């Protein structure tokens, strides 16, 4: 049979299950595709690589000998083979090196999820492969009509919350998808009664979306290094589309990105101006709000189905004694997020 899914949904499935994009991402990370093909990637190996990186992070802060750091570096490259070619393997002896490798592992974890979903399941012929891969996402995906009131609100949110400092590109909404992850409604239900529910942005690389749709937004595993997380291991969101759009890591070569709109149950926010490098919340607080110098104009805030949409144009906040240019929101429980929309964006670079 032929797929009855709308063309934009079919194009989304092709985009998130693109094997060539998975291979190109591994080539960019300088992974040796002969020693470590896409089909050889495993959960166990990525888990053990995170543990090695945490040992490196501990050794660097402890002030361990260069011989122990070299041994941990060598063990990491043995577990994740790299092909540097003309270069000596960079030593993992600083915070920047461990963070670049932890970023690679986060992306490899979701690439492994996408490839294992794609290669799994009943390899029959009765159903269209696009329908088969659609079902592997365990997510209901519907197209939001361009002429709808919903689409108008979302386009206004994209237009008004583009930061002045992120002038490398213009954003254009291609498609708006309404999404419903299986079991997420039931999971979110206890938090639906928490106050201060906001519709916020979450950007990520396109190669992570098969993992995000099938498993939802997740928190970094305990084995992962604690470094590089301004407010600890949690799920981070922005109220400025361009702050999250930067995490799509789109380029002139591939200017099509995916961004989420999630309803997040913030409750009582723990308002911070500087890095806390801690995941523990004070009693009675349900989230962290990192305070930026620029905030969406609160007078243009709208309430949609009991959820605040801060689609106001970026104005000065009043805080100048902060390390953040824009706000960010962090929750430490995966159940405090209900994914609502998925946008396909065109990045028009200057
Ligand atoms: N992804 C986002 O849309 C987003 C919005 C606002 C603030 C954000 C902060 N992040 C974020 C992204 C990545 C990380 C680390 C850094 C590299 C190692 N593992 C993850 C920490 C924070 N992402 C944000």
Swiss-Prot record:
Outcome, altering residue 137 to P: 1.5% of wild-type activity
Domain PARP catalytic, chain residue ranges per copy: 128-350
Result of changing residue 248 to R: <0.5% of wild-type activity
Modification type Phosphoserine: residues: 122, 126
Outcome after substituting residue 223 to Q: Does not affect ADP-ribosyltransferase activity
Effect of substituting residue 222 to G: Does not affect DNA-independent poly-ADP-ribosyltransferase activity
Cross-link (Glycyl lysine isopeptide (Lys-Gly) (interchain with G-Cter in SUMO1)): 88
Binding positions (NAD(+)): 202-204, 211, 218, 244
Effect noted on mutating residue 230 to V: <0.5% of wild-type activity
Effect of mutating residue 333 to G: Abolished interaction with TIMELESS
Effect of residue 239 to N: 0.6% of wild-type activity
Record-annotated PARP alpha-helical domain positions: 2-119
Localization (cell): Cytoplasm
Stated consequence of mutating residue 266 to F: 1.5% of wild-type activity
Active site: 328 (for poly [adp-ribose] polymerase activity)
Crosslinked residue numbers (Glycyl lysine isopeptide (Lys-Gly) (interchain with G-Cter in SUMO2)): 88
Subunit-structure text: Interacts (when auto-poly-ADP-ribosylated) with AIFM1.
Purpose of the protein: Promotes AIFM1-mediated apoptosis. This form, which translocates into the cytoplasm following cleavage by caspase-3 (CASP3) and caspase-7 (CASP7) in response to apoptosis, is auto-poly-ADP-ribosylated and serves as a poly-ADP-ribose carrier to induce AIFM1-mediated apoptosis.
Protein name, as recorded: Poly [ADP-ribose] polymerase 1, processed C-terminus
Organism name: Homo sapiens (Human)
Gene: PARP1
Positions spanned in the full protein: 662 to 1010 of 1014
């Amino acid at each position: 049979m032929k797929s009855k899914l709308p063309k934009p949904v079919q194009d989304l499935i092709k985009m998130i299950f693109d094997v060539e994009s998975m291979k190109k991402a591994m080539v960019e990370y300088e992974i040796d595709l002969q020693k470590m093909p896409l089909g050889k990637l495993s959960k166990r190996q990525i888990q053990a690589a995170y543990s090695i990186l945490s040992e490196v992070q501990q050794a660097v802060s402890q002030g361990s000998s260069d011989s122990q750091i070299l041994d941990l570096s060598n063990r990491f490259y043995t577990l994740i083979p790299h092909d540097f070619g003309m270069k000596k393997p960079p030593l993992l002896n600083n915070a920047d090196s461990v963070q670049a490798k932890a970023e690679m592992l986060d992306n490899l974890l979701d690439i492994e999820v996408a490839y294992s979903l794609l290669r799994g399941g009943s390899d029959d012929s009765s159903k269209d492969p696009i329908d088969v891969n659609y079902e592997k996402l365990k997510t209901d995906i519907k197209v939001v009509d361009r002429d709808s009131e919903e689409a108008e609100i979302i386009r206004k949110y994209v237009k008004n919350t583009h930061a002045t400092t992120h002038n490398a590109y213009d954003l254009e909404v291609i498609d708006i998808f309404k999404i419903e992850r299986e079991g997420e409604c039931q999971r979110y239900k206890p938090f639906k009664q928490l106050h201060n529910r906001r519709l916020l942005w979450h950007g990520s690389r396109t190669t992570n979306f098969a993992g995000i749709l099938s498993q939802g937004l997740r928190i970094a595993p305990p084995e992962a290094p604690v470094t590089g997380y301004m407010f600890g291991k949690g799920i981070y969101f922005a109220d400025m589309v361009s702050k999250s759009a930067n995490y799509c890591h789109t380029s002139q070569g591939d200017p099509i990105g995916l961004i989420l709109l999630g309803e997040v149950a913030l409750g009582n926010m723990y308002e911070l101006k500087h890095a806390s490098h801690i995941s523990k919340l004070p009693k009675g607080k349900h989230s962290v709000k990192g305070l930026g110098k620029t905030t969406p104009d609160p007078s243009a805030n709208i309430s949609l189905d009991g959820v605040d949409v801060p689609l106001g144009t970026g104005i000065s906040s009043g805080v100048n004694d902060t390390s953040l240019l824009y706000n960010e929101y962090i929750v430490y429980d995966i159940a405090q997020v209900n994914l609502k929309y998925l946008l396909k964006l065109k990045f028009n670079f200057k």
